[model samples]
Target chain A: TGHIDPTKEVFAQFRANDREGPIHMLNLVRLRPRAAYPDETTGAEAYAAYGRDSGPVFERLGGKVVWQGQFELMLIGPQDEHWDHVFIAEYPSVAAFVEMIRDPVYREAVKHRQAAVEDSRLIRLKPLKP
Target chain B: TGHIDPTKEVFAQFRANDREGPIHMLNLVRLRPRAAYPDETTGAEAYAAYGRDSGPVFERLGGKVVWQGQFELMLIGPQDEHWDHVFIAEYPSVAAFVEMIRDPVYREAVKHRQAAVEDSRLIRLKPLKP
Candidate 1:
């Protein structure tokens, strides 16, 4: 099954630790051929709408796109696992992330994300010296 | 069930592209608790050994780590998918990457990776405006 949303159990774990410092959220999104919206919209269109509408909320929370790249090949992974959108967004704190999600505007904006995404992986990471 | 290595079919596809320009390889690795070698060794130690042995081969081929981070949480993914290492390594070109893999030093070094890794994903990406 395609992973779209975080389960309550997992979200709870995400919120539980509550550690300080900026957190990087790695996003790997696979778009649907057609959006789930009622209108005749493509997955890419819906996702773009999600970004446009949610940008303010994301920025208000001090979120920034740290790195982004275009997906090319899955050299060593499930053949079916192809990502259309790949980026890492960093939030100043865990609370900022939670706040952004709780924002009413963001809540509505995420509908477009739900309509566009067929599958996605969002992994939280702590930036380390490289 | 754990994804470890690329299939011959996938490797052929990787080689077929022969795309120019630098490519970023995103690696998400999950390590085994105990190394698969005859001697007692931890997975972390085995993987570190792989890095040490393969360093010259990688650098000689123009490979450099662009970004790396510590795995913290799986905010959105399969519950069992826990990554131990997260990094993006860049190669000057697809040919450089292919050459690195063909190097005898790298070939020998990869044995440690086989012994240490329980699951991993290696993705090829083209850097984009972020």
Candidate 2:
């Protein structure tokens, strides 16, 4: 499942039309490993490469890139792991979302993506109204 | 500046404390590019490369990785851009956030990160109660 923009007027209509409407959100990610021979210089280079190569493709694809941050954890516990960065994107509708994944241009762009990182995962859900 | 976990009980205290406690959120991201000379096998190879490189580092660091998806848009519009994948992560408190970024291990991880991507951006905000 993917996100349906709550900010859109149509979504409002959906909410009105059905007690429950299709409002889905998705999470996607790619992870790259540290160099076999790790060093400060190489690490900085890796971070830069990942961004330059992948960021543009995302912008080109039409998804609204929302948030990005780098983080470290002060507290250590079962639930804690420091993250280098975080990002969020929004889509207008689910149909549009379906089209985005299937487009050939995107498939082609994946080549650039393939070079920069090692692993990736995507998660999907609906935004809950608090 | 950072995120306040919605699930946390203290968050309720803040809501009660100020009728408007400081509840903030943020967006963070990293991106990488393909190798200089791309090949069909390399393209597939690169995709896997990014994931394997970064995923474990994220888990080790303490951030909750959520919502990871790969996408391409069929409709062309101002908002349409193909994205290889998207990911979301959540944190419990702003102080915890500061710690996540400041930790030495996280800094060490940054070295690996630099090698993986070229550019990255982080955006921060608070969720509206709506």
Candidate 2: tens digits of C-alpha lDDT, residues A5-98 = 2225533333343223232333223334542222122433554654555455545655565444433221211122233343445545554555
Model 2 stretches astray by more than 4 angstroms: A1-30, A33-62, A74-82, B1-130
The candidates' interface RMSDs, in order, read 1.1, 13.6
Expressed as tens digits, the lDDT of each residue in A20-76 for candidate 1 is: 988999999999988998658989999999999999999888999989988889988
Candidate 1 lDDT score relative to the true structure: 0.91
Model 1 clash pairs are none
Candidate 2: TM-score? 0.34
State candidate 1's DockQ.
0.82
Candidate-wise lDDT, in order: 0.91, 0.39
**Model 1 regions lying over 4 Å from their true place:** none
Model 2 complex DockQ against the native = 0.03
**Most accurate candidate by DockQ:** 1
Model 2 CAPRI rating: incorrect
**Candidate of highest TM-score:** 1
